[PDB]
Design a protein around this ligand. Sequence first.
Ligand SMILES: *[C@@H]1O[C@H](CO)[C@@H](O)[C@H](O)[C@H]1NC(C)=O
Length: 402
Amino acid sequence: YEHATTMPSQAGISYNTIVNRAGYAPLPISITPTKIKLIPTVNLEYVTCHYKTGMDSPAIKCCGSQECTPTYRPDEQCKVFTGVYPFMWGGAYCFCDTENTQVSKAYVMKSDDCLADHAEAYKAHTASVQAFLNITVGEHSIVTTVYVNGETPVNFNGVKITAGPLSTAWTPFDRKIVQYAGEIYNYDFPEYGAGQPGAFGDIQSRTVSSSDLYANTNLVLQRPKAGAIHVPYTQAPSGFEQWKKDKAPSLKFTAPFGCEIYTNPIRAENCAVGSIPLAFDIPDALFTRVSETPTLSAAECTLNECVYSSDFGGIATVKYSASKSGKCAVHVPSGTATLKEAAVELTEQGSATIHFSTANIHPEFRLQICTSYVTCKGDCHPPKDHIVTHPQYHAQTFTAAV
Ligand SMILES: *[C@@H]1O[C@H](CO)[C@@H](O)[C@H](O)[C@H]1NC(C)=O
């Protein structure tokens, strides 16, 4: 039997329903998503880190000419400064006053700490939603991880569960993101091969172990001081450091819909966004006839207490006269009231207690119970505290009138 019902995509809050037919007893169904995960399809564009400016030892020729011998290292600068007269701890290096030459060259390379202190620049394409759910059908219970795509089923005990596509496809990650120190940032980093100096991406590598290294650090050499041996260089300050100094708070403190953000895998969890269109294919063999189950006759309902509140502040007693003692389900076919409990136990004729949370100030709802239903009605009072530390349990509704 094919049944389908939208389930609000809230983490920690439960959801209940009853599936029934003209000659088959109510079969309860309960769902509880303990963690809804939003993994995006992601690939690595590069990794960046602090640079370090390596530099070959100056090659000094005493009154002889030199040449800018080229090598091919990242962001290389090579220059042949003439008219030098260097000094060491032992005195003047050369005897010719003029015509001495010093060839000096400098280059960029990855910091020694880049293997463990680096930022990963990624592109995030599309979303994949998977949720850890607790599903019960007529006391057949399962705890699973369902891939929310409408395709992948979870088929334990013969009932086939399919969690349709997340109704409002949405991600907190833009197309192009960055990971650093276990925090995910939305940042339009330069494409590989366009990194500009003094900003994020000044040095880049396709992988942490990649041989290639593009560097654009605005490296330019200056002539050394007379009587000193060294390689002067003025360079744009490390763009990665500047990004660290100047960056907005991570998505874990700015993401919409209250999403939590985690980094392995890159993902967002507990996004209170949209709803999951669950579809349940219940086998014909799991249904039970109305005759077998406890049948209720001549029930009455009364709200012995009502506190219009986020939690289950509403209490109602049902006086029952059952045909045979046992257990059976209880529900409200309406968004007015959401029940804490799924089923109750009955002993011939007596009373039972139902907990619920409500939106209506003047509540009235049909409590469906054990192959019957009773019209519960009453007046309800406001709650105590202005602010509470948990999310809503009761479906909001327009009617809150006198
Ligand atoms: C779901 O099942 C798991 C089983 O480990 C349990 O720990 C968790 O509390 C259950 N959640 C609810 C309230 O259904």
